Structure 1
Amino acid sequence: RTIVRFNRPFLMIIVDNFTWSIFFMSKVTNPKQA
């Protein structure tokens, strides 16, 4: 009964599971923002 709703600003951090490096990082404050 747990809901996870990305309907507000959120962060993504993309990693390599072995080297633990960060390939990419994002903050999405507005997914329509051109």
Structure 2
Amino acid sequence: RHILRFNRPFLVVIFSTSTQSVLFLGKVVDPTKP
């Protein structure tokens, strides 16, 4: 219950708290493709 393993596809939301803006949005399906 007190563990998270990001070892499968996940979403990423980078958020400016001063402006309430989504700066970047994405999904990691395969992290070994640059």
Unaligned stretches of 5+ residues in structure 2: none
Q: Secondary structure at the match of 1:11?
A: strand
Measure the CA separation in 2 of the matches of 1:21 and 1:32: 28
Figure out how many residues of one structure are paired with residues of the other and give that number: 34
Q: Which runs of 4+ in 1 moved over 4 A?
A: none
- Identical aligned pairs, as a percentage? 47
Unaligned stretches of 5+ residues in structure 1: none
Measure the CA separation in 2 of the matches of 1:33 and 1:8: 14
TM-score by length of 2: 0.81
